[PDB]
Each structure stands twice: as structure tokens, then as C-alpha cells.
């Protein structure tokens, strides 16, 4: 039988069959309920919408994300999301296919135990396995050595892997990702008079961020350049026909990734986190780690962020070392592609958590057979 892989990220759900090169269903993970009082009989009869349907009708819904910072907080909405993914997007019966799920490192242990319980009771999957997102991202790169900087919608984490061996004491995690950047862009958009407060307007701001933001190689010279002329200004059309124009806000929003102090957080930037995580490894593997930075996740495709990251690490690393950043164009799905590869290996068919093995041990089994 064919395996299933389902990357329930913080913002988007990726699903598909093992052995395929790309996800088959990609929809935003939002569950919305109406907030106005219906008046026409026979038309308002649904209670909640899932995925793209919620996005299309976001004008009269309240959109809620069932995941906050990689940790699931509303389990009923998550049940709805998984039900939709299994039935309406993939059109398969989960009782006939093993599933592979993903999780960020240093996540609360209760989060994965409940995932195991939901899979093994409500959906009755024959077997399931939980994998660390950053490790899978390295599978879909044809490498077995490097440090992975995975940054999605909720969690940005680093996992250094050398010759297949992970150094868990050097795993760094940071709660600063795409949702925080969207919120910051929403906060600073009020400087020009544009105010967005509702969840639908939050989605609008997120789309603007996706389409018009880029990372500056040199922040201070870029700030002078935008303040001296109007070359960097760009125009975006709101869905109702209004036109908005943004200036330095194009490269100020992604700048929080390197200077988290803008949004009140004390942690260091992503480059300093990468450097600290590398410096906690053994002295004989740093040279290989500098040459194999792997970047993946949706927050990673800001234009020019690879060059900025390389410049920062070059400034932080010794001169004689060579810094190479690896950013393939398909890094929005590196985690999912790696998950597809891993479930397709012939040496993996012995590490599934079978149904019988869960009944004997309980939800605690997922802690032993998984990392």
C-alpha cells in the first residue's frame, strides 16, 4: 500500500502520496465560523468552513488558526482539518494508508501523544510515524551533512546534522516566523494611514507581505535610499479597488528576522542563532557545517535573504572558512519532499508505529520509537 505524508504546518497544510515529487493538496489551515446573523432560509445552513472555502468567504467569517507557534491549541478544529485533508482533498480512506506527520523540535510532549491518539482512535490509521521537520528537509537535498534553518509560519528552528548523527544539545528554537512578520507589517502599515484589524484584513496584509517584501543586503543604506527618492515605492490594489503604496516598509518587515528587538523580543537574529548553534558542535565538524547551510520554509523565499544570511555569517565566521548557503527554488516544499522520500525508502518499513504496538504500550510509545 502507498504511504501518506501530511505536514500540518502552522499556516499551511501539505499532503500527498509517498513517491510523488510535489504535494497534491495545499490549503491554508484556517477554520472559520459566521459572525453575522443569517436572514435567507435554505442558504445559511453550514456551521464552519475549512481551508480555501474559508478564504473565499472570509468577508463574513471569523478566521481562526488551529496552530499557534507549532503547538496545537484547538483540538476540535484540528480534527476538522485532518478530516478535510483525508476526505475532501485526497479522497482516500485513512484506514487503508499509513501516515507520516511532522513536528518541530523541542515541542511539548503532550502535543505528539495526542496526535498519536487522534490518529489511532478517531481515524484508525494502520500505522503512523512522527518526524522532525528539519531532519526531513535535509533528505530532500541529497546530503547527509549540514545545518538546517527551517522557518515556517510558527517556528524557526536549527538542527545541525553531521554524517547522519544529530547533536541534540545544539538544537536551537525560536518563536519568530511568518505570522509575527505579518503582525509587524500590520502594525507599521498604520504609519501611512492604512488600518487593518480584522482576520480577513490580516489575510490581506499577509498577501501583501508575500508579494511586495524583500530583504535588504545593507539596511542603513537601503533606508537612506528609500528616504531620498521614490524608486523603491510600489503599488498594490486592495480587493475593493482601493490602491495602497508602501515605501521602506518593504524591507523593514523582513528585517525583524535579523533584529528581533523590533517586536519586543530579546532573542538574537537568525544569523546569530545559526552561528551559536554551529559553535556548540564539536570542533572537527564546524568546517563542514559552514559549507552546508540548508534553508527551507515559506519564510525563507524573501528575495535576497540568502545573500544577507551569507554576508552575516561571513562577518561572524573566521576568514579562512568558506560559507555556502544552499537555497533550492523548491524550498517551500523541502520538508514535504523529504517526508515523501523517507516514507518511500525500503529501510523505513520497519520503523512504523503499528496499531498493535500502540495498544500494548499506549500513547507513550511515540516517545520511544521517534526522535
Amino acid at each position: 500500500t502507498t504511504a501518506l505524508v501530511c505536514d500540518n504546518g502552522s499556516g499551511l497544510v501539505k499532503a500527498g502520496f509517498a513517491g510523488d515529487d510535489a504535494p497534491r493538496a495545499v490549503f491554508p489551515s484556517i477554520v472559520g465560523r459566521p459572525r453575522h446573523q443569517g436572514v435567507m432560509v435554505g442558504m445559511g445552513q453550514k456551521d464552519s468552513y475549512v481551508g480555501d472555502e474559508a478564504q473565499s468567504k472570509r468577508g463574513i467569517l471569523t478566521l481562526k488558526y488551529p496552530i499557534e507557534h507549532g503547538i496545537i491549541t484547538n483540538w476540535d478544529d484540528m480534527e476538522k482539518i485532518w478530516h478535510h485533508t483525508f476526505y475532501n482533498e485526497l479522497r482516500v480512506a485513512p484506514e487503508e494508508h499509513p501516515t507520516l506527520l511532522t513536528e518541530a523540535p523541542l515541542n511539548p510532549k503532550a502535543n505528539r501523544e495526542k496526535m498519536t491518539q487522534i490518529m489511532f482512535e478517531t481515524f484508525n490509521v494502520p500505522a503512523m510515524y512522527v518526524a522532525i521537520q528539519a531532519v526531513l528537509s535535509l533528505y530532500a537535498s541529497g546530503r547527509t551533512t549540514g545545518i538546517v534553518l527551517d522557518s515556517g509560519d510558527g517556528v524557526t528552528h536549527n538542527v545541525p546534522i553531521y554524517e547522519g548523527y544529530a547533536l541534540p544539545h545544539a538544537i536551537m528554537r525560536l518563536d519568530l516566523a511568518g505570522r509575527d512578520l505579518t503582525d509587524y507589517l500590520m502594525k507599521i502599515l498604520t504609519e501611512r494611514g492604512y488600518s487593518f484589524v480584522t482576520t480577513a484584513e490580516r489575510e490581506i496584509v499577509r498577501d501583501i507581505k508575500e508579494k511586495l517584501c524583500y530583504v535588504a543586503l545593507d539596511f542603513e543604506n537601503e533606508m537612506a535610499t528609500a528616504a531620498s527618492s521614490s524608486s523603491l515605492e510600489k503599488s498594490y490594489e486592495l480587493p475593493d479597488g482601493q490602491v495602497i503604496t508602501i515605501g521602506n516598509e518593504r524591507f523593514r518587515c523582513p528585517e525583524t528576522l535579523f533584529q528581533p528587538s523590533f517586536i519586543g523580543m530579546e532573542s538574537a537574529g537568525i544569523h546569530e542563532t545559526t552561528y551559536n548553534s554551529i559553535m556548540k558542535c564539536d570542533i572537527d565538524i564546524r568546517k563542514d557545517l559552514y559549507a552546508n547551510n540548508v534553508m527551507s520554509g515559506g519564510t525563507t523565499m524573501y528575495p535576497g535573504i540568502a545573500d544577507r544570511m551569507q554576508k552575516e555569517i561571513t562577518a561572524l565566521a573566521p576568514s579562512t572558512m568558506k560559507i555556502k548557503i544552499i537555497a533550492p527554488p523548491e524550498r517551500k516544499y523541502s520538508v514535504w519532499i523529504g517526508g515523501s522520500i523517507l516514507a518511500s525508502l525500503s529501510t523505513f518499513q520497519q520503523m512504523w508505529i503499528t496499531k498493535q504496538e500502540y495498544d500494548e504500550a499506549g500513547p507513550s510509545i511515540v516517545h520511544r520509537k521517534c526522535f
Binding site: 446573523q37 435567507m40 456551521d47 484547538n74
Partner: protein
Amino acid sequence: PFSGLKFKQNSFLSTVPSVTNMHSMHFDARETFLGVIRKALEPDTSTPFPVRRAFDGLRAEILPNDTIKSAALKAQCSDIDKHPELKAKMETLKEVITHHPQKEKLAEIALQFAREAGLTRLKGETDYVLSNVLDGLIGDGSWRAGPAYESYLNKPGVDRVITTVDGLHMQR
């Protein structure tokens, strides 16, 4: 039996619907309200695993999130006297609900549905599962009496007030 069961402080704020939406035409005042209570009783991780597992299974049988299970349960819940286990099972939910640290906030939420959505329109002929839940929230059981709506067809303060716009076009 469920000593040391802890709860999250504001896990049930995000489930209550909009006050406006409680006036929709095809709106459900029982399924939505039970969903609010179902999320309110969810045990956090601080609860020990053996105790936590016992309550979760019980809630999945009396307050399910599904619709088919709720409909099937409601079918056998009307004539509850023929299911002694359900009487004893739900009687456990009496003690935990009335001992909930957030009992007052749920009660104010509970009356919000009664005032506008009107889940207690049957005022006494309420479903055994639904009526018993409300008994834990408010022990007096006075919700069966009536939500005390206002009728002012007589309007003792009769107005007959003519304003600026009414002044422009007035008969007689």
C-alpha cells in the same frame, strides 16, 4: 473520583459565537452551546495521565464533538430511565461542572444563549443531557421558569413624539 483535575483559564472564550450570529435563522442553540461546554472541560497537561485518560473517554460519550453520535445519544436520552448506566454516568458530570473554577463565567455565557438564541424555549421539557448540564451551572434550576422577556405593547410611557423629520410630513 476525579480529584486533582485542572482546567485552562480561558480555553472557552474563543468558542462562543458572535452575539449577532445568535440571531441567525438556521442557527443551533444546543449543539453550539454544548461545544462551548465541551471545550471548557478539556483537561490540561498538568492533570496526571491516569486521571486525564478517564475523563476524556467519558466526555467523548456524553459531550461528543460529532453530530451523528449526538443525535443517536439524544434518541436514547429522552427515555433515560431505561439506561441506568447513563444516569450514573451523567451524575458524575454534575459534580465536576459545579466544581469548575470558571463556573460563573460559563453561567453568564449560558444565560446569553437563553436570552437571545433561546435554548431553554421548552422551559421544562428540555433534553435530559441538556437540562442536567444547566443544573450544574445554576443549582436553583430556575431557568425552567422563564428568561423574563419584555412586552410593551401597552407602552405605559406612550410617546407620540414628533421630531424634525416627522414634522416635515405629518397627517391630520
